From Swiss-Prot, chains A, B:
It comes from Homo sapiens. This is Transcription factor COE3. Expressed in brain. It comes from the Eukaryota. Residues 3-86 form the IPT/TIG domain. Belongs to the COE family.
Length: 133, 133
């Protein structure tokens, strides 16, 4: 009757945290906590087979073990969930945004530096016109 | 032993579709089909309590019922999942990436899901071919 993790969805998120994640498994109950590496968060019980959490921030990117905890007892250490944190400022991601900043078309009224949301919006507009539909 | 939906997560998404939704319930099996409104969608069994799907696009905002089907028999009509399609708001980083994941050209030997850095590298390659000095 111990809580067990069978799957986690999504399995990745940004280091800034705040993503909704569903943990699927067995023997869940109200009050169960979830630990991402060392970062503990509380959960919402959906059914005994699913709980919902918001990811905690993590200082560094990388793979973490996801385990469960209740009254400081750890569960799932022998079969932990896997969750991957990515940093928006990882050098290869950042270099991609720097490339886009130089060639994304600027529209009247734009700020001097286009925000990343806009770089991505217009890159997708352009790629959709090439390969979309 | 009747398949039953207890919840869906998330229960809203954009009209453009392509979001991962987990359908949580009881008595799920391989070959059970998922219907969003009137659209049959591809699904994958995670456990007998969880199915994963990708939302189909829907041109018009609003609620649809999620029901299940097997051998043309319908389940869950009396207690369906309710999924709300939502008109697009301001561009976000994640939405921009979701758009690129759908249209960035794939190469032989690519992972099913391109990493963010690869989405950007390829988007930058294409945009530099349009506007690069
Ligand atoms: Cl543009
Ligand atoms: Cl993506």
């Amino acid at each position: 009757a111990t809580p067990c993790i069978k799957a986690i969805s999504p399995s990745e998120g940004w280091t800034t945290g705040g993503a909704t994640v569903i943990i699927i498994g067995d023997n869940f109950f109200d009050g169960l906590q979830v630990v991402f590496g060392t970062m503990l968060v509380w959960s919402e019980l959906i059914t005994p087979h699913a709980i919902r959490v918001q990811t905690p921030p993590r200082h560094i990117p990388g793979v973490v073990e996801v385990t469960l905890s209740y009254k400081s007892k750890q569960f799932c250490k022998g079969a932990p969930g896997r969750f991957v944190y990515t940093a928006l400022n990882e050098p290869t991601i950042d270099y991609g945004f720097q490339r886009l900043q130089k060639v994304i078309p600027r529209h009247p009224g734009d700020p001097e530096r286009l925000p990343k949301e806009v770089l991505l919006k217009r890159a997708a507009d352009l790629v959709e016109a090439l390969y979309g539909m």
